[PDB]
Amino acid sequence: KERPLGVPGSAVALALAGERALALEVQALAAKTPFPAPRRVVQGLDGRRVDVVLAVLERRLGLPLANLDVYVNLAGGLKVQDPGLDLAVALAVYSAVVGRPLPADLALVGEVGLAGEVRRVAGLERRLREGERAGFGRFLHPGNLKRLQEAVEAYLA
Amino acid sequence: GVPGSAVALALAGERALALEVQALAAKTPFPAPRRVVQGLDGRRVDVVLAVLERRLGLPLANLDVYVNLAGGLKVQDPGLDLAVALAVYSAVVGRPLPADLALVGEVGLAGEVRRVAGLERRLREGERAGFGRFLHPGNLKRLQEAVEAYLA
Amino acid sequence: KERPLGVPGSAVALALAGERALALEVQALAAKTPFPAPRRVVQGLDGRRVDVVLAVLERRLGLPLANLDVYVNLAGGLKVQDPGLDLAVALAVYSAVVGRPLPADLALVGEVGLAGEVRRVAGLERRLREGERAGFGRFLHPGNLKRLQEAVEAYLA
Amino acid sequence: GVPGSAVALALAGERALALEVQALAAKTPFPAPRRVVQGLDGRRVDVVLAVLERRLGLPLANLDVYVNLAGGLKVQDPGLDLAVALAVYSAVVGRPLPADLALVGEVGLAGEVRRVAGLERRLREGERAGFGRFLHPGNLKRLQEAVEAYLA
Amino acid sequence: KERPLGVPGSAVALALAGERALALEVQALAAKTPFPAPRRVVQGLDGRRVDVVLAVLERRLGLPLANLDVYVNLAGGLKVQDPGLDLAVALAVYSAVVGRPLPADLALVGEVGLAGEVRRVAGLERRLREGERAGFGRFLHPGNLKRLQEAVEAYLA
Amino acid sequence: GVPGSAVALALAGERALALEVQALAAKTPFPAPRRVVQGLDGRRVDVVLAVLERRLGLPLANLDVYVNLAGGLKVQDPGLDLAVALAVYSAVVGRPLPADLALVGEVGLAGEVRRVAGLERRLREGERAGFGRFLHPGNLKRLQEAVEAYLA
Q1: Could you give the 3-state DSSP secondary structure of residue F117?
Q2: CB contact under 8 A, E73 and D106
Q3: What is known of its domains (chains A, C, E) (predicted)?
Q4: Of the residues A100, A104, B80, D21, which has the maximum number of CB atoms within 10 A of its CB?
């Protein structure tokens, strides 16, 4: 998987798809909307989980989403439910909105709570091993990250 | 202790678990406000919110409201109503619940708290998980009492 | 099941849930709506059956529903399809709108037709026995009630 | 004999039954009026209403319309179209149908009445149930004839 | 099946329902709409396939559909997915809009593409035999028809 | 060679086929324009259109858009994205693609073209079906290149 370099709105998640650890690319695109209510298109992910993430970004991090068309896409055609994808969704969207990309060597694991906190998920060890195997060198996960704001200060400030 | 978070002693399938119910409320930019529900039955959350607005006088009509069951699971369990009601109230009013409190109960349209399956298993799991204080249909009859006792 | 005393909008139905006779509490709440179209939330019941009942109340009994938010709820988490629940739905809602409760010793059985009539249902005997067993002393059912208007004159005038 | 009620000789699964189709119509408070259907296929009711408005000139565009299959069953049976059409017409125009009349037929977009499965079983069940007069694809070709013969 | 004579909006399709060749009547009714957006009711057919056909009629053949209520109905209660029904849907609707009927001896087979072309379908031979058996004498199908416009010039000009 | 038509080398289930993807675009009469999709996943078409508008500057916001998978099949296959993107572009801009060209590729939100399952089977089927020229993830990286090479 050889992907777009330095385009904002891209974030790698160390996911569990079914029973298998996979590193996947979460993509997001944000744009000033013409319509009265902003478009919210989600493909390959749980739209509801995404809404929660979008709400946290807007309310807890002050991202100006309410007039922004937001598209979120899991590259590669899979459909994945994993709560561990939240972090990557949160950061892809943030990256897409402020227009600066994430490092290419970073992989992301975590549940996102309505308070903006990052929460433990199943299979952290497997997820991390697979990220190592796939060649990543920096990791944000619930072991080393507690609040979403910290990850933003660290990579998207 | 950020406001808008409440611990329910749930039955998920056959299994008793302490789960975190979360809510966020803020002024809506829109004609009709957003209701988003994750991990919980949307119609039950809808009933609870109507009780909160109409029986308790919580001004939800111009608020965006988001309710989230933390942990990944999707649980339909009437027993979660109490946590949902309290999480929302807390969130709206900016005052948090104690960290050592766990909640169980169905919530009716009159604002009353109703018996649910598996009370003893729920309570045991709360004890085991380290909670010190409990609100359940055995010691609570109405939402109002819970709000008075904890949300000042 | 020890329930709210003298709150309007509460009505006991002698239902068939699957194959079993159960006495259940139908609850309704009515409120002056802020929105242009009034909310209609139904939980644990057939929304369509409810609509028919709401239409009969408005058109045949003159209940001023069109600007009223109406919530109807089957207490106890079950989801029940029984047509025999119509009567209780009709009376809960009526009670909730006019703001006077039903007697606590009354149990209700019947289908509601679009003309406002009350119609026979399956398992009347079982339903009634269970109501007796559960301690009720007064019964409206298709054996003793033909029109919805009669039940209203009798308990909610 | 209140208007807006018609008896269909239906096939529900394999079984012939005489069922009551009911309709209610009244002036709508709204920009677009309510269509509520219970116990019947909503798209078939939709087609029938379009025939009633466009072929027969019934002024349904500003009417609330409710159609109800009495008895609890959900039946999809093209054979019910005739009763539905007549129940609605009756309701709109405030004139009832005789009590001894039973109806069978599919209704096309031209307003015609079309053959259906199981005519003889349907008719036998009508006889047995005590009905005296019948409208079916064997003796009726168009909705208009039915309306002229019974809804004056 | 003895059907309405010379009413516009009627078109016979030689369909495959499941595995069986059947001649079926596609009916359409078009009317000047009161609402802002025009009604689109489809019964017994694939609504999406119909939309494509309606789009072709409007965009490629200049039918003034945008303010027209359109109802399309497969007579006889079946629900059929066959792409071979497109032609008949296209011509029923056209017939209903311009208010002139199709000949009663004509049967129709074909897929309709977004360019207005008519495309091959499965089971042409079976379809045609059944049309012959049912007593039709003229046939439009992909063997003898390439563009939708040709069929219109031939029967609905 | 009418504009708005593109040939994809698809995997439908296990099977490689050359299929025609079609699009039509025209000025919308409405506040918000129509999106109709047939035979393809609507969310994937939605993503592709957003890439076309936001990355490539195609003015889709006031256009009605219809996308059709010719042939009857319903195929979900990320490999179809390229044909969909090109069919739409072509349609909007009134310039057609050569008749001998076949296309394969997933399209990301950055406008890039991504690897898909079964490339060799897809290409073999294209050869066999008589196509002379191919665009696939082995020789194309971005949508822009495809647009420059063929849609002038």
Answers
A1: coil
A2: no
A3: The middle region has homology to RecA with ATPase motifs including the RadA KNRFG motif, while the C-terminus is homologous to Lon protease.
A4: B80
Burial of E12 (0-12, 13-18, 19+ CB in 10 A): buried
Length of chain B: 152
Q: Take residue A97 and report the two structure tokens written for it.
A: 């909105």
Angle between helix axes B81-93 and B42-54 (nearest 10 degrees) is: 50
Q: What is the DSSP string of chain C?
A: ----SS-SSEEEEEEEETTEEEEEEEEEEEEE-SSSSPPEEEESS-HHHHHHHHHHHHHHH----TTEEEEEEETTS-----GGGHHHHHHHHHHHHHT-PPPTTEEE--EE-TTSBEE--TTHHHHHHHHHHTT--EEE-TTT--BHHHHHHHHT-
Q: Give me the residue from B46, B78, B109 closest to C9, CB to CB.
A: B109
Cα distance from E126 to chain F (closest Cα, Å)?
Answer: 18
Residues of E in Cβ contact (< 8 Å) with F72: 83, 111, 121-122
Structure-block tokens of residue C35:
């929105």
Question: Cα angle vertex E19, ends E18, E23, to 5°?
Answer: 80
Report the alpha-carbon distance of residue D132 to residue A128 in Å, rounded. Answer: 79
Residues 6+ apart with CB under 8 A from A133: none
B46 and C42 within 8 Å at the Cβ level: the answer is no
- Residues of A within an 8 Å Cβ radius of F: 1-4, 7, 9-10, 25, 27-29, 31, 34-35, 41-43, 69, 71, 73, 75-77
Phi and psi at residue E13, in whole multiples of 5°?
-105, 140
Q: Classify residue D98 as exposed, middle or buried by CB count within 10 Å of its CB (0-12, 13-18, 19+).
A: exposed
Alpha helices per DSSP H over D23-138 = 42-54, 81-93, 119-128
What are A12's two structure tokens?
């790698």
Instruction: Give the single-character DSSP code of F79.
Output: G
Beta strands in chain A (DSSP E): 10-17, 20-32, 40-43, 68-74, 106-108, 111-112, 118-119, 138-140
Token pair listed for B105: 């109960």
Query: Residue B70 is nearest to which of A48, A113, A122, comparing CB atoms?
Result: A113
- Which residue in chain A is spatially nearest to F109 when comparing CA positions? A27
Residue found under tokens 């946290």: A56
Site from F20, F22, F24 to mutate, E interface, most E CB atoms within 10 angstroms: F24
Domain limits, chain F: 1-152
Technique used: X-ray
Is residue E88 a contact partner of residue E26, using CB atoms and an 8 Å limit?
yes
- The answer to whether D125 touches D9, Cβ cutoff 8 Å, is yes
Q: Do chains E and B touch (3 or more CB pairs under 8 A)?
A: no
Q: Find chain E residues with C-beta within 8 A of D108's C-beta.
A: 3-4, 25, 27, 73, 75
In chain E the beta strands, taken as DSSP E runs, fall at 10-17, 20-32, 40-43, 68-74, 106-108, 111-112, 118-119, 138-140
Q: End-to-end alpha-carbon separation of chain C, Å?
A: 28
Query: Resolution (in Å) of the shown entry?
Result: 2.7
Nearest to E114 among F34, F66, F71 (CB): F66
The answer to whether A13 and A88 have CB atoms below 8 angstroms apart is yes
Residue of D nearest to C38 (CA): D30
What strand order describes the sheet that includes F101-103? F35-38, F63-69, F15-27, F5-12, F101-103, F133-135
- Name which of A5, A24, A33, A43 to mutate to probe chain F: the one with the most chain F Cβ atoms within 10 A of its Cβ: A43
Q: Do E49 and F71 touch (CB under 8 A)?
A: no
Residues B89/B65, Cβ–Cβ less than 8 Å: no
Q: Among E10, F131, C78, which residue's Cα sits nearest to residue B44?
A: C78
Q: Strand A40-43: give its sheet, edge to edge.
A: A40-43, A68-74, A20-32, A10-17, A106-108, A138-140
Residue B6 structure tokens: 């409440």
Alpha-carbon distance C23 to C130, whole Å? 7
